[PDB]
Structures are given as structure tokens and as C-alpha cells.
Design a protein around this nucleic acid. Structure first.
Ligand SMILES: [Mg+2]
Ligand SMILES: [Mg+2]
Ligand SMILES: [Mg+2]
Ligand SMILES: [Mg+2]
Ligand SMILES: [Mg+2]
Ligand SMILES: [Mg+2]
Ligand SMILES: [Mg+2]
Ligand SMILES: [Mg+2]
Ligand SMILES: [Mg+2]
Ligand SMILES: [Mg+2]
Ligand SMILES: [Mg+2]
Ligand SMILES: [Mg+2]
Ligand SMILES: [Mg+2]
Ligand SMILES: [Mg+2]
Ligand SMILES: [Mg+2]
Ligand SMILES: [Mg+2]
Ligand SMILES: [Mg+2]
Ligand SMILES: [Mg+2]
Ligand SMILES: [Mg+2]
Ligand SMILES: [Mg+2]
Ligand SMILES: [Mg+2]
Ligand SMILES: [Mg+2]
Ligand SMILES: [Mg+2]
Ligand SMILES: [Mg+2]
Ligand SMILES: [Mg+2]
Ligand SMILES: [Mg+2]
Ligand SMILES: [Mg+2]
Ligand SMILES: [Mg+2]
Ligand SMILES: [Mg+2]
Ligand SMILES: [Mg+2]
Ligand SMILES: [Mg+2]
Ligand SMILES: [Mg+2]
Ligand SMILES: [Mg+2]
Ligand SMILES: [Mg+2]
Ligand SMILES: [Mg+2]
Ligand SMILES: [Mg+2]
Ligand SMILES: [Mg+2]
Ligand SMILES: [Mg+2]
Ligand SMILES: [Mg+2]
Ligand SMILES: [Mg+2]
Ligand SMILES: [Mg+2]
Ligand SMILES: [Mg+2]
Ligand SMILES: [Mg+2]
Ligand SMILES: [Zn+2]
Lengths: 84, 117, 23, 69, 69, 181
RNA sequence: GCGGGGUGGAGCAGCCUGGUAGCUCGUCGGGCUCAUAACCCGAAGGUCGUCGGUUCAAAUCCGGCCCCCGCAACCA
RNA sequence: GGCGACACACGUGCUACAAUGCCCACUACAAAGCGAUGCCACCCGGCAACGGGGAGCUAAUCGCAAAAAGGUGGGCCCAGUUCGGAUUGGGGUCUGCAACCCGACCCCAUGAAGCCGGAAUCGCUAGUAAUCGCGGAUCAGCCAUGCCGCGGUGAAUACG
RNA sequence: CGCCUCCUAAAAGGUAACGGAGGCGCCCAAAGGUCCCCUCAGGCGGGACGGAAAUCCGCCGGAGAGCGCAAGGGUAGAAGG
């Protein structure tokens, strides 16, 4: 994990999008590409669309998933199984 | 089942006998013999119930072990599974979590080899 | 144990220091 | 009961570790014990021993409010 | 012409002394909207079957089409 | 009989609480314990090492009561089972012996259970009685590590003159049965 | 009508004598070879034609039902 | 985002299965190379990874730097172990916009297979094989157990 | 092809056919005498391993169990254990 010296990381072009809905009118569909962003407590209860290289994965956010990034919730390898 | 939930081997030294318990590596066996004041070189068979209760009381009250440990462990894995994140998706299936390569190897997370015709 | 990071020996091999190999 | 097939029961004393003393009966007039009902962490109110862990997972994590607006 | 898409195998392997003969091809075949024509997709990945053995693996699917079942 | 701690507790502390909660117009309407049956469900002595009266001294030190044998009713193929096969032990505890044993089982043994989160508050008969299943046997004070050879659990039948589980909960409760929920 | 039969992909044991499925080929993985056969190491595949009964237990004993071989079908 | 996929098969290796060993402390003996938004003494904080300091050096000058095996003594006593370190939980440290994919390191807990390998098969004839550490290219960091080098200890056998 | 059970068999008995269906050619030294005691199958609920079904506890359950083997009759107020 990252170094605690620097603040935890959020793209700021997204945290801007998280808070601006908190005041105007929650909520619509935030199409994101920043898989790198740690989930901020201000996101909870939102639906954000993590891209996987091809498509926008709907990700509804809850209070047990915070430290984890938006990337953990939209895999890229599509698998199914082997030998079926 | 003396200390903690599991009775420890006599004849062997206590800085390893105490490691014969889930949750207690050599270093927790390092620190639990200065803090309760007992010689590491003495055997479980060469103690006194004074030396027994001090240790048992200390060891059980400090960190969490045994079932509760495993419980929280599974709990942490169950959460990682629940959401569910990739980290926890690799527990569902049962492949490596810490991003290994799978093409070859990984036989520890995958078990005995299912040779295919 | 050259793979045992919890030894002087397993730490030498990887070329790192720690509690288990102090400098 | 039936003669000479039963383990006689005598005034026994079971001592626990936490200093607790039970006076019941047994086949062994004196017995020592790990944990019991005066010390066991289910039996003792709410002693969580070490773990009021608890639901620190999650966002107690904070550390901190260090992102600009 | 057919009335349900199938997926089938064709194993022409005769190995008993140098003499040779190895020809292996698994395919999907489906019924087109009538009047269509003969459609042939080289969906071979890489060189799993070499490039040179594909002209004459159409000429074998194509040839045997001259007589239905 | 003789003075034993849980027995005195029944008469002079538990009873009257009960009479409060449920109001009985007769002193016999008020829940008693009838008996406590221990059964080593067993079957580890089928075609294997048939004679385990090492189990029957286990039981006999716990209760001070030699148990009795149980034999296979119908013979059964899949259980490797020949009718009249010894497949277990049963000891029936009543009165002082019952009190003495139940006493030691609440005061020491049930806590000596690893990972104990409390007895199941759902194993009630629907008709007043309660049943617990113990998974091994070092649980009991008079049983050491240096006596064992195998881990045998056992089934505990707790039998009561209660008519409902409501009054069965209460009664066992008041005597100190630790229920998880 | 009388007899025998039906079990891994093929061919054959086990059935009589209830318990536990075996042999040779073939298949598959690995080996040797430039390669292929041969050969060497290793492995998987029946759930015993079906339905019913006996039994604690049925490929096995008993009944019916589908199928296949052999013999009979004469004085007329 | 992928080249890091995983039902599987092959090649090349590393680390092991232990007592000629493994762990902890005490103490020795190399070479070749590298180093100015680079090497980093020593002092201090932290069990540590590292961080805040801060001296020297365009370096037969100061430094990376301890070489390691080995030597002295002490502990474990043949066990899936004080052998083994894979896997997993939690916490961290640094590089870098950013470590979910997908980094390396630290420490805490976990402590799997593996008891010397079927058919088959490689290397080496002397400072070689075996074994032990060191450096360098690349390089922000690093998935290097790879590669190209360097020295320590140091064999066996060749009738034919 | 002899023997046992059922049906045909027309409510005593008996009653045929190359009529419909089974079974016997044994067994048990206790599976015999007697005394004493005990009551089943099945259903629901509860109980470590333990499953539909091993053993344990509860409640319901007149007999559907059991009675070595076919079937019938009989049978717990026992012929059952
Ligand atoms: Mg441990
Ligand atoms: Mg990796
Ligand atoms: Mg080595
Ligand atoms: Mg080790
Ligand atoms: Mg804020
Ligand atoms: Mg030819
Ligand atoms: Mg209930
Ligand atoms: Mg009752
Ligand atoms: Mg005929
Ligand atoms: Mg056949
Ligand atoms: Mg025969
Ligand atoms: Mg036979
Ligand atoms: Mg082969
Ligand atoms: Mg050529
Ligand atoms: Mg060949
Ligand atoms: Mg049957
Ligand atoms: Mg038949
Ligand atoms: Mg003829
Ligand atoms: Mg004639
Ligand atoms: Mg990529
Ligand atoms: Mg690649
Ligand atoms: Mg082990
Ligand atoms: Mg093993
Ligand atoms: Mg170990
Ligand atoms: Mg971790
Ligand atoms: Mg990464
Ligand atoms: Mg050995
Ligand atoms: Mg070796
Ligand atoms: Mg030469
Ligand atoms: Mg190197
Ligand atoms: Mg390698
Ligand atoms: Mg008549
Ligand atoms: Mg008449
Ligand atoms: Mg007459
Ligand atoms: Mg007749
Ligand atoms: Mg009889
Ligand atoms: Mg009789
Ligand atoms: Mg008699
Ligand atoms: Mg019943
Ligand atoms: Mg039940
Ligand atoms: Mg068992
Ligand atoms: Mg009957
Ligand atoms: Mg019969
Ligand atoms: Zn106590």
C-alpha cells in the first residue's frame, strides 16, 4: 500500500464530482476512468461507472467498501471456466 | 487444553511450546517470557502453576488467538468475498490473491493436479 | 532457509536488512 | 444403587485458575481447572478480553480529512 | 442444407511409421438465410494450424459440399 | 439426600422467581427437573475394536454412575451394522447424582468448552425438555489429557416437568444455563 | 416350444458359492525417436439390459418385461 | 485495459526435504567493479522497512562495504521439527501523477507440499565439478531465482 | 407327477380342468420346559460426529410391527422382546 506521509489519493476530477452532487441534487451516473481512486466516505451510497477497458461497470457503494479502489469492483479478465 | 485453548508439549522449550498455539509466533514467544518473567530455557514439565497462570493469563488477555482469530480471519475473507472485490473473488474461485501468475504453478491455492485428456 | 525472510540467512540472500538482520 | 460397579462419589473440591473455588462432589476429591464460570468471558458480563475490535472496519479509518475542496 | 447450427470435429490422423497423415480441424456450421451463399471464416488463432494448410482445408469443406446427406 | 449447591439454589432462589413470572396456583405446577440422560451416541465400536469400556469409565467418572450398553436394533448394511452390535452407552442421572453432575457441568465444564459462545436457545423440545450435544470429553473436570485415547462426544438429554419451552427456558436459565441469544 | 445369453470403447472373466468388479486390446498423460510405429512408466472410463420382489446387503438369488444366439417345430 | 488469464502439458531455474544440519551471539580472510537532481559516513527516532539530519568524495583519498562459507562457544536431539518457507489475515516503508489489475521491502500471525523423486535424462577431467558470498549492465521502482562478471573453500575418477 | 397356502369353491364339508398365483424336501440345544419382567411399526419435535434410517430424550401412535422360510389364520389380556 501507499505511504501514509502523502494523503490518500483521489483523482480530484472525481472528488469534485462526488461533492458537487452532495449540494445540488443527488444523483446521476458518473462515468469514470479513474480506477486508481480510493473510495472516499463521501462516495457511499453512490453509483459510479468503472470502465474495464471496454464497458462501464455500474458500482453502487457501501460502508464496508472504503479503502478499496474502484478498480477492485470491475474486473477486466472475463473468465467463466475451463473445459466446460 | 491448558494455555490457551490447546495443551502444549512438555519436554520442549516454552519459546516454541508457546508457538504451538495459533496466533503466537516466535516473537510473541519472545515478548511473553520477559513480560511475565519466566526463563525460556525451562521445559513445560519443569514449571510451577504460578509460572503457569501468569503466562496463561497474560497470553490469553493480550492478543486474540485460536477460534476467534480464525473467526475474524474468515470474517475478513467473508467481507472481501461479500462486496465483492477482486481480492475476494480470488477466494471464491480459490486462485492466488496476491496477483501471482497461474499458467504454471499456483498448486497450493489450486491443490492436486487435474490432468486433462 | 534462503527463502526464509525471518532469518539472517534468508535475508542475506535477498540482500535486505531488518530485525532479523540488523546493520 | 448397585454395589461394586459404581465409582464412589465423594466431597470434592474443584479449584479454578482465577482463584475461584467450587464445592461440589466428584470421584476425585481435589481437581484443578483452566477457566470457569466466574472467569469465562461469556460468563463474565461483557469481558471482550482484547477485542471490542470491532466494526473499526470501515471508515473509522479516516486519516484524515486531508483532501482539498 | 441444415436446420440447426452444430459444432463438430474431423480427425484425420494415421501415425504408424513415418508415412505421415495429420489433419485436424474443429468447426461450427450454421444455416444461413436462404439464398445467401457459402460463407467461410478463417477464425484460426495464430498459426495453430499453419497458413499453408488453409487453402486446401476450404477446398475440402467446399469439395464435400457437392453432395448432401 | 445431601446438600449440593445447585440443588439448594433450585428450591430457595429459582422456584420463587418462576412462581413470580408465571404464577402457579399449586406447588407442583412449577417446573422440576425430572432426569438427565447421557448418551454416547457412538458406533465407533462397530466392527472396530468392539470393546470400548474405556468409554464407560469416561462416563463413570463424570457421573459416578456406570452406564448401560446400547445394541443395534435393526441390522444395517451401510452402517456396517449387525443387529445386537454394541453401538453405544447410556447413563440415566436422577436426584443428587443428577444435581451433582449438572452442577459441575454448568460451573466448570461448559466454559472449558473451546470457542463457547453459549448453548443453543432453540434446542427446546416443544414439550419442555432440552438437548445439548457435546463434541468431546476433556470438557469435564475429572477427565484429563492423560486418560484419553480418542475424542468421544455425547448427547445430553435434559428432562423437565415443564409443559412449554417458555417455562423450560426460564428454569434452565435461572439455574445458570448460558444461552447465546 | 426347449436351452444359453446381455458387465468400462472391443473381446472376455466375476454369477454357480450375496458383501469385495478382474484379463488382453483400446483411450488418455508422460517417456524414446528427426519423426512415426514398436516398446517403457503412469492414469482415467462400467456404475453390471431394464422394471419389481428377497435380503441388513443383489452384477450375483427369484418374478415380469425388451433384445440376441442355439435347437425344435414330427405322423400331417 | 491487456501482454502477469488457468482445466491443463513441456523446457529453464531457485528454494528445500535436514544433524556434514538449522537458529542466536562473539570474531576473522577476497577480488572486480560502480558512484555529482550519484555513492552515502556517523549521530539520532522507529523491533524494522525507511525517515529527519549531516561529514567526506568529480573519488588507489570519502563511500557502497557486512563479503559469505569458515573460526570460538552456547541452544534445539531426529520429530513434518527450532527442517521447510509456499499460502493467506492485519499493519506498515519507499519509488513514482498513480501499485485494483500489477510493484519491491519490512514486521506481526498463518507454518502447505516436500522424508531424496516412475520411465527417462544433463553437466563436469583440476583450481574444474560442488558449494559460499560479491559486483555490474538495464534501472524511477521492480516481479532477477535471469544474465554477464568476481574472488573464498575445494574434491572424485579415467582400466579401457 | 408327492406335500403346504390362497383363489376358483356357488356363506357347513367336499368339489375339476395342460385354471390364476406362491412355497416345501429344511431348521433351532434353544428358536425347547417353566417362572419373572417388558411392548411394537410409523409419524412429528429435540440431540456431537450421525446421513431418510446406528444410538438418546420427549409427545402422538390397538396394532399397520414382530411371530426363522410361502401363504393364510391367529396373536400385545402375547404366540412378540
Ligand atoms: Mg505459531
Ligand atoms: Mg509475484
Ligand atoms: Mg544450501
Ligand atoms: Mg525456519
Ligand atoms: Mg473532507
Ligand atoms: Mg507404406
Ligand atoms: Mg425448538
Ligand atoms: Mg416435559
Ligand atoms: Mg413359450
Ligand atoms: Mg461387453
Ligand atoms: Mg462360473
Ligand atoms: Mg460369489
Ligand atoms: Mg502413450
Ligand atoms: Mg532436417
Ligand atoms: Mg511413438
Ligand atoms: Mg435389492
Ligand atoms: Mg431379469
Ligand atoms: Mg434348424
Ligand atoms: Mg416319424
Ligand atoms: Mg499493462
Ligand atoms: Mg511475457
Ligand atoms: Mg507441520
Ligand atoms: Mg505430508
Ligand atoms: Mg518449522
Ligand atoms: Mg497483507
Ligand atoms: Mg501495481
Ligand atoms: Mg528423517
Ligand atoms: Mg540434499
Ligand atoms: Mg576438455
Ligand atoms: Mg546478484
Ligand atoms: Mg528462476
Ligand atoms: Mg367352501
Ligand atoms: Mg356351499
Ligand atoms: Mg367330514
Ligand atoms: Mg385342479
Ligand atoms: Mg419359534
Ligand atoms: Mg417361542
Ligand atoms: Mg427361558
Ligand atoms: Mg419410534
Ligand atoms: Mg430427527
Ligand atoms: Mg464418531
Ligand atoms: Mg403383522
Ligand atoms: Mg421367503
Ligand atoms: Zn476461575
Amino acid at each position: 500500500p501507499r505511504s501514509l506521509k502523502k494523503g490518500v489519493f483521489v483523482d480530484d476530477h472525481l472528488l469534485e464530482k462526488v461533492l458537487e452532487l452532495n449540494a445540488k441534487g443527488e444523483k446521476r451516473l458518473i462515468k469514470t476512468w479513474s480506477r486508481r481512486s480510493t473510495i472516499v466516505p463521501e462516495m457511499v451510497g453512490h453509483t459510479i461507472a468503472v470502465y474495464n477497458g471496454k464497458q462501464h461497470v455500474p458500482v453502487y457503494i457501501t460502508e464496508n467498501m472504503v479503502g478499496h479502489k474502484l478498480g477492485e469492483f470491475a474486473p477486466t479478465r472475463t473468465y467463466r471456466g475451463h473445459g466446460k | 487444553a491448558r494455555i490457551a485453548g490447546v495443551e502444549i508439549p512438555r519436554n520442549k522449550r516454552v519459546d516454541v511450546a508457546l508457538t504451538y498455539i495459533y496466533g503466537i509466533g516466535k516473537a510473541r514467544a519472545k515478548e511473553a517470557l520477559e513480560k511475565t518473567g519466566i526463563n525460556p530455557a525451562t521445559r513445560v514439565k519443569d514449571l510451577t502453576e504460578a509460572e503457569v497462570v501468569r503466562l496463561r493469563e497474560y497470553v490469553e488477555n493480550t492478543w486474540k488467538l485460536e477460534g476467534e482469530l480464525r473467526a475474524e480471519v474468515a470474517a475478513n475473507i467473508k467481507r472481501l468475498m461479500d462486496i465483492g472485490c477482486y481480492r475476494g473473488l480470488r477466494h471464491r474461485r480459490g486462485l492466488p490473491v496476491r496477483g501471482q501468475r497461474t499458467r504454471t504453478n499456483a498448486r497450493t491455492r489450486k491443490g492436486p493436479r487435474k490432468t486433462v485428456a | 532457509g534462503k527463502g526464509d525472510r525471518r532469518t539472517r540467512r534468508g535475508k542475506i540472500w535477498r540482500g535486505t536488512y531488518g530485525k532479523y538482520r540488523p546493520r | 444403587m448397585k454395589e461394586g460397579i459404581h465409582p464412589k462419589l465423594v466431597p470434592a473440591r474443584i479449584i479454578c485458575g482465577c482463584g475461584n473455588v467450587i464445592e461440589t462432589y466428584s470421584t476425585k476429591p481435589e481437581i484443578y481447572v483452566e477457566v470457569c464460570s466466574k472467569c469465562h468471558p461469556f460468563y463474565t458480563g461483557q469481558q471482550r478480553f482484547v477485542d471490542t475490535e470491532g466494526r473499526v472496519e470501515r471508515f473509522q479509518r479516516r486519516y484524515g480529512d486531508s483532501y482539498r475542496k | 442444407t441444415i436446420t440447426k447450427p452444430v459444432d463438430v470435429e474431423g480427425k484425420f490422423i494415421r501415425q504408424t511409421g513415418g508415412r505421415g497423415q495429420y489433419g485436424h480441424v474443429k468447426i461450427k456450421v450454421e444455416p444461413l438465410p436462404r439464398g445467401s451463399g457459402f460463407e467461410f471464416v478463417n477464425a484460426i488463432v495464430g498459426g495453430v494450424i499453419p497458413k499453408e494448410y488453409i487453402p486446401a482445408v476450404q477446398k475440402g469443406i467446399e469439395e464435400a459440399m457437392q453432395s448432401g446427406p | 439426600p445431601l446438600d449440593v449447591a445447585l440443588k439448594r439454589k433450585y428450591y430457595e432462589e429459582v422456584r420463587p422467581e418462576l412462581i413470580r413470572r408465571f404464577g402457579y396456583q399449586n406447588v407442583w405446577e412449577v417446573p422440576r427437573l425430572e432426569k438427565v440422560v447421557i448418551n454416547q451416541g457412538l458406533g465407533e465400536a462397530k466392527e472396530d475394536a468392539r470393546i470400548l469400556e474405556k468409554a464407560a469409565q469416561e462416563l463413570a467418572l463424570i457421573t459416578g454412575q456406570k452406564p448401560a450398553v446400547t445394541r443395534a436394533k435393526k441390522s444395517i448394511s451401510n452402517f456396517k451394522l449387525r443387529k445386537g452390535m454394541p453401538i453405544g452407552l447410556r447413563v440415566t442421572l436422577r436426584r443428587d447424582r443428577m444435581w451433582i453432575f449438572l452442577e459441575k457441568l454448568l460451573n466448570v465444564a461448559l466454559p472449558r468448552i473451546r470457542d463457547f459462545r453459549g448453548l443453543n436457545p432453540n434446542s427446546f423440545d416443544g414439550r419442555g425438555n432440552y438437548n445439548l450435544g457435546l463434541r468431546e470429553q476433556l470438557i469435564f473436570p475429572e477427565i484429563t489429557y492423560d486418560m484419553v485415547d480418542a475424542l468421544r462426544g455425547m448427547d445430553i438429554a435434559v428432562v423437565t416437568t415443564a409443559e412449554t419451552d417458555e417455562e423450560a427456558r426460564a428454569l434452565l436459565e435461572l439455574l445458570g444455563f448460558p444461552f447465546r441469544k
